[PDB]
């Protein structure tokens, strides 16, 4: 990857981790409405990170 | 509550990150990745919307 590609990979890694952290926070709030969306959010973040990692990592 | 506001703000920060990463991927040759990021961003917008309705 170029430097720009690596910056995008790093940001995808960050969102993967940050979405896991927000999911845990919502689960502690027993905020089911939000945690339901957050789980799907984190799944897409994981998918994107793995996709970027394969390509530029 | 402090805990609720922490989660709302984190949702907003994730929304900003997902918009930023979708734009970066669109700027790169990254169709496969940008397609995923479109859905990722729609989820971050919906989570922020929902959390704002509840805790804003």
Domain limits, chain A: 1-57
Contact A8/B43, CB-based, under 8 Å? no
Calculate helix-pair angle for B31-55, B2-27, nearest 10 degrees.
Answer: 160
Torsion of CA A1, B20, B31, A6, to 10 degrees: 10
SS3 content of chain A, % helix, strand, coil (to 5): 90, 0, 10
Contact B10/A18, CB-based, under 8 Å? yes
What's chain A's length in residues? Answer: 57
Are B33 and A51 contacting, i.e. CB atoms less than 8 angstroms apart?
yes
Interchain CB contact of B52 with A (< 8 Å): no
How was this structure obtained?
A: X-ray
Q: How far lies B38's CA from each of A14, A32, A38, B56, in Å? A: 17, 24, 16, 25
């Amino acid at each position: 990857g170029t430097k720009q590609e690596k910056t995008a990979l790093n940001m995808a890694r960050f969102i993967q981790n940050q979405t896991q952290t927000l999911l845990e926070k919502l689960n502690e709030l027993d905020a089911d409405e939000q945690a339901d969306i957050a789980e799907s959010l984190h799944d897409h973040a994981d998918e994107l990170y793995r996709s970027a990692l394969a390509r530029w990592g």
